[PDB]
Amino acid sequence: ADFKFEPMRSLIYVDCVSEDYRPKLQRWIYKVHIPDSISQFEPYVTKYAFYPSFPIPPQGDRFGYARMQLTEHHWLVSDLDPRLEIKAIAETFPMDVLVWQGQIPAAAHAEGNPFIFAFLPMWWEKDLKGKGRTIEDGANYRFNMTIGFPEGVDKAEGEKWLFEKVVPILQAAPECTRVLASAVKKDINGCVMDWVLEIWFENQSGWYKVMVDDMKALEKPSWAQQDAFAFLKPYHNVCSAAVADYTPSNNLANYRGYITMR
Amino acid sequence: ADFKFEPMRSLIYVDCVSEDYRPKLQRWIYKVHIPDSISQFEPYVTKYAFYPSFPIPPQGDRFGYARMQLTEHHWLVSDLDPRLEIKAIAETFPMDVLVWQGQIPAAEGNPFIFAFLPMWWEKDLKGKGRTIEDGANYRFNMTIGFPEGVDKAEGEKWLFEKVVPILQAAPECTRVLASAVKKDINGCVMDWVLEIWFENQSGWYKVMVDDMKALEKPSWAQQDAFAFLKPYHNVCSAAVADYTPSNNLANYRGYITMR
Amino acid sequence: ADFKFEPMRSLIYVDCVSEDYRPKLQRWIYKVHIPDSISQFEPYVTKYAFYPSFPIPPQGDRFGYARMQLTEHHWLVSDLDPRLEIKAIAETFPMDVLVWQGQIPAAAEGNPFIFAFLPMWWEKDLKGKGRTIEDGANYRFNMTIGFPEGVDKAEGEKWLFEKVVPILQAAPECTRVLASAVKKDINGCVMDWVLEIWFENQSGWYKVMVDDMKALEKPSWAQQDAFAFLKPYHNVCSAAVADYTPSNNLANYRGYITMR
Amino acid sequence: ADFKFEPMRSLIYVDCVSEDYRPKLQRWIYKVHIPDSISQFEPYVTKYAFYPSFPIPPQGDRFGYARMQLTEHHWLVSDLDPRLEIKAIAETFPMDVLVWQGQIPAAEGNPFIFAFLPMWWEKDLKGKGRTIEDGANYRFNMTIGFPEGVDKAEGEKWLFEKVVPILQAAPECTRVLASAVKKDINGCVMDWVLEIWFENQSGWYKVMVDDMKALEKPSWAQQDAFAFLKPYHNVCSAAVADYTPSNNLANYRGYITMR
Amino acid sequence: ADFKFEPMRSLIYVDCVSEDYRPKLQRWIYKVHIPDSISQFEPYVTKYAFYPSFPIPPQGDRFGYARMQLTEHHWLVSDLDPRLEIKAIAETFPMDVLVWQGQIPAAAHTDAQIDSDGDAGNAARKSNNAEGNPFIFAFLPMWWEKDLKGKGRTIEDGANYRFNMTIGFPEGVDKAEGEKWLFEKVVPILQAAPECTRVLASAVKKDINGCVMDWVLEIWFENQSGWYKVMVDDMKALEKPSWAQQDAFAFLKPYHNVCSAAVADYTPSNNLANYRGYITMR
Amino acid sequence: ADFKFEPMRSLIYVDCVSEDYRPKLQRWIYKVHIPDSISQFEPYVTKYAFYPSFPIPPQGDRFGYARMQLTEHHWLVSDLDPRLEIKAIAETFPMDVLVWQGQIPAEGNPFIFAFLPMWWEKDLKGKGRTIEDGANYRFNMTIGFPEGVDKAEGEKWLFEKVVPILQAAPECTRVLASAVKKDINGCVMDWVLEIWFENQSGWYKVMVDDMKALEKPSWAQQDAFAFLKPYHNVCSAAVADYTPSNNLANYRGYITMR
Ligand SMILES: [Cl-]
Ligand SMILES: [Cl-]
Ligand SMILES: [Cl-]
Ligand SMILES: [Cl-]
Ligand SMILES: [Cl-]
Ligand SMILES: [Cl-]
Ligand SMILES: [Cl-]
Ligand SMILES: [Cl-]
Ligand SMILES: [Cl-]
Ligand SMILES: [Cl-]
Ligand SMILES: [Cl-]
Ligand SMILES: [Cl-]
Ligand SMILES: [Cl-]
Ligand SMILES: [Cl-]
Ligand SMILES: [Cl-]
Ligand SMILES: [Cl-]
């Protein structure tokens, strides 16, 4: 049977719940996970990249801040087609990776956080501020944020709140240079998230001024899961990362094995 | 909504209207344009390449000869789908570039010719089976579009029944390939792209200038001799080699400068 | 007209019928064939690789063992679409290549050029699901079979999956069994199935594919007395290869650099 | 005259004194500095890499912790040979870079520390035979330079008879390597570079902070606790991973921007 | 015996004497010569690049303008050490290449491999046919010896029309006399011209391969007009030397005693990093 | 102290003593050894490559034929300088590798690691041959005269008795040779030669049949040429002109077949 052409970009929000885990998680990612992944999807993924996150900003924990990276894939076909479950060689994936990313608590003496894997079209659906901005305009502090409204909130009500109450605050702030948004493709993998936005600042201070201070003017919604914006449960209904314009980890082009420092 | 699988090869005819503009145009192309472009389309363009024009031959001006390069993309989706208009980072594009390329004049402008095609030539009209072992080719790539009010079928018939037979008869001409331009993509004015190979510039001249003198001048003619079309507006062209070092998705490593 | 999105993996079973041809065939492949091929299909083939064969095992000749390599392509469109026949530069492909590969005999008869198209993902996972590269090196025995003319395809299929595979499953020396139906509609390949069957090494391969298969009964359509009961190089081709190849050509080729 | 074969490894400790500067400094490093650097030294530098620092650990400020990266070069000739001062194209360098790194304060500064070493560690004092299969390392690279008028041999003795044994005794520390700085190349004030491995940040702290409390404070001390040297001036450091994707001569493909 | 560490940069001035030869010469260069060269010297050459020439400017012929490219190598050892004459695989080097480049006149049977008692490529690169133009292969230190104008210029200051020129004073002319003329008469004209943004120069290492050239300069302009204004118009002011081989600057015999090329800041042909075989257009 | 500039090419003759070891040895070579090696010497080795051996020819065992590969390094400094013994990260090298290569039984064969100058010292046949002249079957062979045998006398035998047989044979298209640098690492080998043929049959006709004309020297360790103890005093491999495993330029990690 045919395979459908389904160009998509996906984002995974990779946390690191303790600095003591960073070396181990980073090693698995760069030494094990890259070669396993490329081995599987080289023929139908056109780009595979990691964007390490900037240091977590003040109150970043309230936004489900991914303390390791964003992982980005560009797919030509849906990875969740059941026919794609079969692979010659399966990923080497230690259970400890779930500990390091916070999906399960360590057995030593934290509630677990879900694996958030959001599929999107390759092109942003909404361009809400900063159209025409070029790389010549300067370095961006790019705050990539995904949200999913809690169970029993009408999705249209959530959409309307996002674009009529939240985005306008972003748009008004001179500190914010770009707002982009796309609806999550929920039909692919059942992701609980509903929207991905990217919101650019000059720097962390700008991010804080708008995303913490300006957002205080918002009414607390009846569905709120925390007292302040985003009013959503960290790492379950909101995840995020702030990243640079460029990454050296463009894996299909740049990987040459796990060469170690001398 | 879905995106349609739409594999295409596109050609842009990049001119440089004065030699004094050459260093500047070339810098923008290789230092600024390449990375902006790869940044946008890496996930859905499988090949992005520049083929620098050979030196403009005698009377090449009459063929809308592109004095910088051919720019070639291979697309998996239509770049003109309205959804593709939104981009995080827009290309750095000074108005000067349009001057250097001649889109805005010294004197009327020359249009930006961006012709979409299928990935595979639709007509193999001469030299089927030529291999790279048969020798270096002087590859003359030419696009033409019939003027306002000329019936496209009459234009087509002229091309394939009058023009091509002359190329077929010349032993200087080793290859003739053609495709109809995909007009549905971007409203390109051009109607056909052809590639016509010779051994060298003299061969090109013998066939495209002298042998073509035998053609009768069409009633729609916009200049006195073949291609009888308005240079840079209804005909563009470049002669290029078989190989380019500028296969950009594979070969680019940043703008490293000479020591 | 439209071009259909048709993602596929293809395998070509490349023999070298005499050791004296190896340097010539190998030169053509790596010096001439690679750049011609990349030139043609770079924009719509996402992977192009060669997997050199391990040394032919005992009785490998009975399995149509390809003594040069497997050639693997991953396609986005069908290469057999007639619109794809046209190309600016044709491949430099002297008939000597078909002599070296055994398509044209020395002067028994020629062996067919076996070019099998498949889905990109294996259709059946029959043993060893979950195996990772960490579980160790594999002797990967890739085999394609085509039932003889006049054998009902469903009958052949039933034989393969009801009789042959259970023997593979029974053998601890066999760590993986994968299979896909050949896409016959693309290019008319005579083969019906491609399987890949992993062992630890040649001795394991032999114990199962030769000794354990003696328990099979000889089918009425047999073209040889022992499994695979099919005509070597005509109705069965194979190769044993490693997990990794350096010849991942769209990523790794830098021209024909010669040893000093 | 001849050029001397002088294979060396150098390290630069690159700080970022405020998070608000990170995006600008990183952009300059990766968009501008890389191609300028490669342009100049490609023919005589065999490796050029950046190792981004792990998040500054607690009390890391007292160790002159570089909050951006280590920059590492492998040289075939001395970059301080006066004949190498001449360059067709000079590096693009906004003054602001010195602010971002803390060399000059925002309108006292910290010096630019650029230490040359042999390509191979001179002393292997703990963990000989450790391979990459034994696990991920928290690699703490530290350079120290004894203050004005402290006898170098007395400093050395202190380092190797008092400091290193604490490292050798700590199970949390898996590796100790050291080389003397080549002071004759560029006047670097540093005297030693050590690299000291741990499993993680907490191990680092246990050893470099807690265990070192047993040391007697030297009479030359510039701060109360180990390393007893002035942060950023007489001691700099960074903790880095075993691997970097920024192996610049092999891996750089231009400043491709996120979509 | 030891091999001496001898880091050097070399330049070859590659002409193409007729446009009809261009496709053939360019094919040999990119299809045949690249892989042969990399195969031989990958272990001791750290950079190997081609910088295609800008279109020959007006009066460029009087400057020995290389109408194909500059070929540039960076060496760690001298390619002229006699021990380096031995090579497992020799360059495929038809005589046609010397025809296309102007080293020898057109003749029958020049598709033949070049002849030599030693190596064909090493002999091809010492070509000095009385009837053609010699093969100019100049060794230099890796770093310019003199920085005469434009110190501190960055790539941010703009695109350069880089005119690279080599000169060799005729037989009989005192080298010190020539040097003084160059640096006290010629260079000051370049220095005085606002159109000229950079002047760099090095002495040719003559001890390596007996190259006839004595100096390599690189002189930058904004463009072809600026080059012309300075190298043709401003240079009319110079008095003609008694040793002159032509009436106007550089007063040297084109292609024999002066060669040159104008090139861009960047080339895509950085061959050790960027070559992926001779992929042909579709 | 200074490091000396010492450009060299080295060869290692890598055997595989049983086909059942091949998948494991090859995995180790390509998955573990490559990155460990590059991690150590990237800054001072300009080339690192493997040339997989052609299938062992008849009587190849008498030439210490390497059934896995030749490993080639080009060094800028001597790897045997004791200062280079120190490495931050050591290589992962289990004793199994020595079993697979035949250095130890499960006395075995020595590890043969020969340093040469980067350029062949002697060009004895086929000077001028280009790659356009055709594919070569390149027989690379290193020999070391037994204990007690005078080196000059061995040398004379090689260049005056053996080589002229190669020169006379039209099947042999190239003869190159260099003296092994014995000062670097104590290698017992004295010469490396490379001898080209069109193919295996040509190799055999010359190296087996034509060499029967040679008198058995008094120091002979086997009855026929090369008269040296296989794997101990003669090793070899036959290889192609090209290898895809040019490791510093071509390696992208251990990507596995799907
Ligand atoms: Cl923590
Ligand atoms: Cl709260
Ligand atoms: Cl002009
Ligand atoms: Cl503008
Ligand atoms: Cl007219
Ligand atoms: Cl060939
Ligand atoms: Cl039988
Ligand atoms: Cl801060
Ligand atoms: Cl400034
Ligand atoms: Cl203090
Ligand atoms: Cl001409
Ligand atoms: Cl400019
Ligand atoms: Cl003279
Ligand atoms: Cl004159
Ligand atoms: Cl002796
Ligand atoms: Cl015997």
DSSP assignments along chain E, one per residue: -------EEEEEEE--S-GGGHHHHHHIIIIIIHHHHHHHHTTTEEEEEEEEPPPPPTTGGGGTB-SSEEEEEEESS-TTSGGGG--SSB---BTHHHHHHTSS---TTTTSBPP-SS-HHHHHTT---TTS----EEEE-SS-SEEEE-TT-BGGG---EEEEEEE-PPTT--HHHHHHHIIIIIHHHHHH-TTEEEEEEEE--HHHH--S--EEEEEEESSHHHHHIIIIIGGGGSPPPTT-SSSSTT-S-BTTTEEEEEE-S--S-BHHHH----PPP-
The rounded Å distance from CA E66 to ligand 2 centre is 74
User: Any idea what DSSP says for residue F147?
Assistant: T
CA D104, CA D110: separation in Å to the nearest integer? 7
Residues facing residue B90 across a β-bridge:
A134
Contact B32, B92 (CB under 8 A): yes
**Structural tokens at position B95:** 């108005």
Q: Do B252 and D254 touch (CB under 8 A)?
A: yes
Contacting F with CB below 8 Å, chain E residues are 2-5, 36, 39, 42-44, 46, 76-77, 83-84, 86-93, 113, 120
* Triad D55, D60, D62: Cα angle to 5°: 155
**Structural tokens at position F4:** 């000396």
Q: Which residue has the tokens 């004497």?
A: E17
Q: What is the amino acid identity at position F174? A: R
CA E143, CA E74: separation in Å to the nearest integer? 11
Residues with Cβ < 8 Å from D206, sequence gap 6 or more? D170, D172
Q: Does a cis peptide bond (omega within 30 degrees of 0) precede residue D227? A: yes
Establish whether chain A is in contact with chain F, requiring a minimum of 3 CB pairs below 8 angstroms.
yes
Q: What is the amino acid identity at position F28? A: W
Residues with Cβ < 8 Å from F123, sequence gap 6 or more? E86, F175, F176
Of F121, D88, F43, F3, residue with least CA distance to E46:
F43
Decide the pairing of beta strands C139-145 and C236-241.
antiparallel
Search chain D and give the residue with CA nearest F35. Answer: D132
The rounded Å distance from CA D3 to ligand 5 centre is 63
Judging contacts by C-beta atoms under 8 Å, the chain B residues touching residue C92 are 131-133
Establish whether chain A is in contact with chain E, requiring a minimum of 3 CB pairs below 8 angstroms.
no
Q: Which string of b and e fits F53-78 if b means at least 16 CB within 10 Å?
A: bbebbeebebbbbbbbbbbbbbbbbb
Q: Do D132 and F77 touch (CB under 8 A)?
A: no
The rounded Å distance from CA E246 to ligand 14 centre is 4
Of D252, D251, D242, D236, residue with least CA distance to D110:
D236
Contact E24, B138 (CB under 8 A): no
CA B50, CA E264: separation in Å to the nearest integer? 16
- Kindly list the domain boundaries of chain B, sorted by start residue: 1-259
Q: Which residue has the tokens 């390393």?
A: D227
Q: What count of CB pairs under 8 Å joins A to F?
A: 52
Judging contacts by C-beta atoms under 8 Å, the chain C residues touching residue E275 are 254-255
Neighbours of chain F (3+ CB pairs under 8 A): A, C, D, E
What ligand has the least distance to the C-alpha of A224?
A: 2
The rounded Å distance from CA F187 to ligand 15 centre is 14
* Triad F217, F221, F225: Cα angle to 5°: 60
Judging contacts by C-beta atoms under 8 Å, the chain B residues touching residue A198 are 88
Of D54, D64, D60, D70, residue with least CA distance to D205:
D60
Residues facing residue A183 across a β-bridge:
A195
Residues facing residue E216 across a β-bridge:
E166, E202
Judging contacts by C-beta atoms under 8 Å, the chain D residues touching residue B256 are 35, 38-39, 42
Q: Do C259 and F26 touch (CB under 8 A)?
A: no
Contact D131, F90 (CB under 8 A): yes
Judging contacts by C-beta atoms under 8 Å, the chain C residues touching residue B119 are 3, 43-44
Query: Residues in chain C, how many?
Result: 260
Measuring CA to CA, how many Å separate D104 from each of A204, D110, D144, D253?
22, 7, 21, 32
**Structural tokens at position F169:** 């044979």
CA D7, CA D9: separation in Å to the nearest integer? 7
- Nearest by CB: B254 against D35, D87, D89: D35
CA D88, CA E199: separation in Å to the nearest integer? 9
DSSP helix/strand/coil, D154: helix
Q: Do A43 and C120 touch (CB under 8 A)?
A: yes
Q: Do C253 and E277 touch (CB under 8 A)?
A: yes
Q: Which residue has the tokens 């479950």?
A: A85
Of B112, D238, E27, D231, residue with least CA distance to E35:
E27
Q: Do F258 and A38 touch (CB under 8 A)?
A: no
Judging contacts by C-beta atoms under 8 Å, the chain D residues touching residue E155 are 36, 39, 89, 92
Residues with Cβ < 8 Å from C26, sequence gap 6 or more? C16, C68, F135, F240, F242
Contact F138, F53 (CB under 8 A): no
Provide φ and ψ at D99, rounded to 5°. Answer: -65, -50
Judging contacts by C-beta atoms under 8 Å, the chain B residues touching residue D34 are 254
Judging contacts by C-beta atoms under 8 Å, the chain E residues touching residue B243 are 27, 30-31, 278-281
Judging contacts by C-beta atoms under 8 Å, the chain A residues touching residue F31 are none
A62's enclosing H/E stretch is none
Where is chain F discontinuous (C–N over 2.5 Å), named by the preceding residue?
106
- Nearest by CB: A249 against D9, D119, D245: D245
CA C131, CA C121: separation in Å to the nearest integer? 16
CA D142, CA D235: separation in Å to the nearest integer? 7
Contact D234, D146 (CB under 8 A): yes
DSSP helix/strand/coil, F47: strand
* Triad C243, C244, C245: Cα angle to 5°: 135
Of B8, B12, B9, B21, residue with least CA distance to B104:
B21
Measuring CA to CA, how many Å separate B41 from each of A46, B91, D196?
10, 12, 44
Question: Integer distance in angstroms from the first to the last C-alpha of chain D?
Answer: 51
Provide φ and ψ at C202, rounded to 5°. Answer: -55, -45
Q: Do A36 and C120 touch (CB under 8 A)?
A: no
Q: Do C203 and F20 touch (CB under 8 A)?
A: yes
Q: Do F256 and A43 touch (CB under 8 A)?
A: no
Q: What stretches of C61-201 show up as alpha helix (H) in DSSP?
A: 96-100, 153-159, 165-170, 184-187
Which class for F9: exposed (0-12), middle (13-18), buried (19 or more C-beta within 10 A)?
buried
* Structure's resolution in angstroms: 2.3
Q: Which residue has the tokens 């790794």?
A: C252
Q: What count of CB pairs under 8 Å joins D to F?
A: 56
- Nearest by CB: C46 against A44, A91, A92: A44
Strand order across the E146-149 sheet:
E146-149, E196-203, E215-221, E161-167, E258-263
Which class for C48: exposed (0-12), middle (13-18), buried (19 or more C-beta within 10 A)?
buried
Q: Do C121 and A4 touch (CB under 8 A)?
A: no
**Structural tokens at position E144:** 């310019």
Of E96, E267, E14, residue with least CA distance to B136:
E96
* Triad F229, F234, F239: Cα angle to 5°: 140
CA A147 to chain D, closest CA, distance in angstroms equals 19
**Structural tokens at position F155:** 């040398």
Q: Do A90 and C132 touch (CB under 8 A)?
A: yes
The region that residue E150 occupies, defined by phi over 0 for left and psi between -120 and 50 for alpha, beta otherwise, is left
- Within F53-186, strands assigned E span 69-75, 113-116, 122-125, 137-143, 174-179
The rounded Å distance from CA C103 to ligand 7 centre is 22
CA atoms within 13 A of residue B97's CA, in its CB half-sphere: 13
**Structural tokens at position A114:** 């879900």
CA D235, CA E134: separation in Å to the nearest integer? 59
Q: Does a cis peptide bond (omega within 30 degrees of 0) precede residue E250? A: yes
**Structural tokens at position B201:** 């510039």
The rounded Å distance from CA B219 to ligand 5 centre is 14
CA E200 to chain B, closest CA, distance in angstroms equals 11
Contact F190, F145 (CB under 8 A): yes
* Triad E251, E255, E258: Cα angle to 5°: 45
CA E177 to chain D, closest CA, distance in angstroms equals 22
Measuring CA to CA, how many Å separate E124 from each of C16, E37, E200, F155, F226?
39, 14, 29, 35, 40
Residues with Cβ < 8 Å from B228, sequence gap 6 or more? B215, B217, B218, B220, B221, B222
- Nearest by CB: E154 against D44, D83, D90: D90
Residues facing residue E161 across a β-bridge:
E221
Query: Residues in chain F, how many?
Result: 258
Of C208, C117, C201, C206, residue with least CA distance to C165:
C208
Q: Which residue has the tokens 């001390």?
A: D221
Experimental method: X-ray
Of B75, B103, B94, B105, residue with least CA distance to B14:
B103
Judging contacts by C-beta atoms under 8 Å, the chain E residues touching residue D47 are none
Q: What is the amino acid identity at position E37? A: S
Neighbours of chain C (3+ CB pairs under 8 A): A, B, E, F
Mutation target among A86, A91, A97, A251 for the C interface, most CBs of C within 10 A: A86
CA C63, CA C233: separation in Å to the nearest integer? 7
Judging contacts by C-beta atoms under 8 Å, the chain A residues touching residue F255 are 35, 38-39, 42
Q: Which residue has the tokens 């005078």?
A: F150
The torsion angle over the Cα atoms of residues B49, B54, B59 and B64, rounded to 10 degrees, is 10
Residues with Cβ < 8 Å from E141, sequence gap 6 or more? D3, D83, E7, E8, E9, E202, E205
Q: Do B124 and C42 touch (CB under 8 A)?
A: no
C206's enclosing H/E stretch is helix C202-206
CA F242, CA F244: separation in Å to the nearest integer? 7
D117's enclosing H/E stretch is strand D114-117
Q: Which residue has the tokens 């690379």?
A: F140
CA D22, CA C30: separation in Å to the nearest integer? 47
Residues facing residue A31 across a β-bridge:
none
Measuring CA to CA, how many Å separate E281 from each of B7, B51, B176, D139?
17, 9, 14, 49
Contact E241, E48 (CB under 8 A): no
CA B140 to chain C, closest CA, distance in angstroms equals 13
